[PDB]
Amino acid sequence: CXFXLPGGGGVCXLXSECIX
């Protein structure tokens, strides 16, 4: 979480587009 499968700082949905 948020929206994005990876778990770290560089993740899918990095920022308002998804997570945020």
mmCIF file of C-alpha atoms in Angstrom, residues 5-16:
data_model
loop_
_atom_site.group_PDB
_atom_site.id
_atom_site.type_symbol
_atom_site.label_atom_id
_atom_site.label_comp_id
_atom_site.label_asym_id
_atom_site.label_seq_id
_atom_site.Cartn_x
_atom_site.Cartn_y
_atom_site.Cartn_z
ATOM 1 C CA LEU A 5 2.611 -3.957 -5.395
ATOM 2 C CA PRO A 6 6.303 -3.111 -4.451
ATOM 3 C CA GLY A 7 7.244 -2.297 -0.867
ATOM 4 C CA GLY A 8 9.743 0.515 -0.544
ATOM 5 C CA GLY A 9 10.462 4.100 -1.494
ATOM 6 C CA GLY A 10 10.489 3.546 -5.219
ATOM 7 C CA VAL A 11 7.102 1.956 -5.729
ATOM 8 C CA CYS A 12 4.296 1.713 -8.181
ATOM 9 C CA UNK A 13 1.863 4.600 -7.791
ATOM 10 C CA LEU A 14 4.611 6.768 -6.351
ATOM 11 C CA UNK A 15 2.736 9.898 -5.284
ATOM 12 C CA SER A 16 -0.559 11.363 -6.148
#
